[PDB]
Design a protein around this ligand. Structure first.
Ligand SMILES: O=c1[nH]ccc2cc(OC[C@@H]3CCNC3)c(Cl)cc12
Length: 312
């Protein structure tokens, strides 16, 4: 399931070859081009690495901390130099400079899926089929090669580009960076994680199932919509604490019927089973009818994407 085609290996090799020419990352080597997004911890800027000429995404995290803590965070982030996959955003490096930690990454010209969703209104099932494959594969890569789980799957942590690539970013790899920061939305957290119980990759499967439902209907799906709201979209206010209680206490969300295929509905239902033991695992998801159908579909994701967001 983790093997790569010719095109993937070549792109992966081309990234590392460009990366090896960068060298030590320093504050003054960066020119700000624009702001890409702002989210958990800090702001992401599209930047120019002046010496190499490489365009990168630079995430700045404002943190006032002793040289002790910052040197440990930088050392902990070095793990990301080992995470080489078509389904994971490329990492250039991390450094600290005058009150802020910088994380330099591959620039994904399509931005994140929370932004694409805002532009599209809702994302078609076939496009979501490609997103699901990429997420499952990214999570399998993290689990198999690095024995780590994502911990924060959500639309804003799924990045897309004009080449039709879909990649995960912002997975927990440093405890010290988490402690010092620490603020993140808990709205995609599985019922077991919100109950402080037994948490594995199964909790990332729930977050993926939830992100897919949001993207398919064009709305965060908790609480479920009424008969009237479903007529508005297809023709055919809760405070954060009330929402987290709703997730733990009520049946999981689901796709509306007679709008989505039964394979897509079943796929999300198997990600959203409250009990993590009954919830589908990565191995089972990889062979689910929805994945096998989406995998065999020839879907122009780059085409759909550039048309939708006006990229070009
Ligand atoms: O160009 C990408 N590379 C790495 C990270 C990244 C993060 C994205 O922004 C994430 C923010 C967080 C909440 N809204 C979107 C931007 Cl839109 C592009 C990139």
């Amino acid at each position: 399931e983790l093997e790569l085609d010719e095109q993937q290996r070549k792109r992966l090799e081309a990234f590392l070859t460009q990366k090896q020419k960068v060298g030590e990352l320093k504050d003054d080597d960066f020119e700000k081009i624009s702001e890409l997004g702002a989210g958990n911890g800090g702001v992401v800027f599209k930047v120019s690495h002046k010496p190499s000429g490489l365009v990168m995404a630079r995430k700045l995290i404002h943190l006032e901390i002793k040289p002790a803590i910052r040197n440990q965070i930088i050392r902990e982030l070095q793990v990301l130099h080992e995470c080489n996959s078509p389904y994971i955003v490329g990492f250039y490096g991390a450094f600290y400079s005058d009150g802020e930690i910088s994380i330099c990454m591959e620039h994904m010209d399509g931005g994140s899926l929370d932004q694409v969703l805002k532009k599209a209104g809702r994302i078609p099932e076939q496009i979501l089929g490609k997103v699901s494959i990429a997420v499952i594969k990214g999570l399998t890569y993290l689990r198999e090669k690095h024995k780590i789980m994502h911990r924060d799957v959500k639309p804003s942590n799924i990045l897309v580009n004009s080449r039709g690539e879909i990649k995960l970013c912002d997975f927990g790899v440093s405890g010290q960076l988490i402690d010092s920061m620490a603020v993140g939305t808990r709205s995609y957290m599985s019922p077991e994680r919100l109950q402080g119980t037994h948490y594995s990759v199964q909790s990332d499967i729930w977050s993926m199932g939830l992100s897919l439902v949001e993207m398919a209907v064009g709305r965060y799906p908790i609480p479920p919509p009424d008969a009237k709201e479903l007529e508005l979209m297809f023709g055919c206010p809760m405070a954060i604490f009330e929402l987290l209680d709703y997730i733990v206490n009520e049946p999981p969300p689901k796709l509306p019927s007679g709008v989505f295929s039964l394979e897509f509905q079943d796929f999300v239902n198997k990600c959203l089973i409250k009990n993590p033991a009954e919830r589908a695992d990565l191995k089972q998801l990889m062979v689910h009818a929805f994945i096998k159908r989406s995998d065999a579909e020839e879907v122009d994701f780059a085409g759909w994407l550039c048309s939708t967001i006006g990229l070009n």
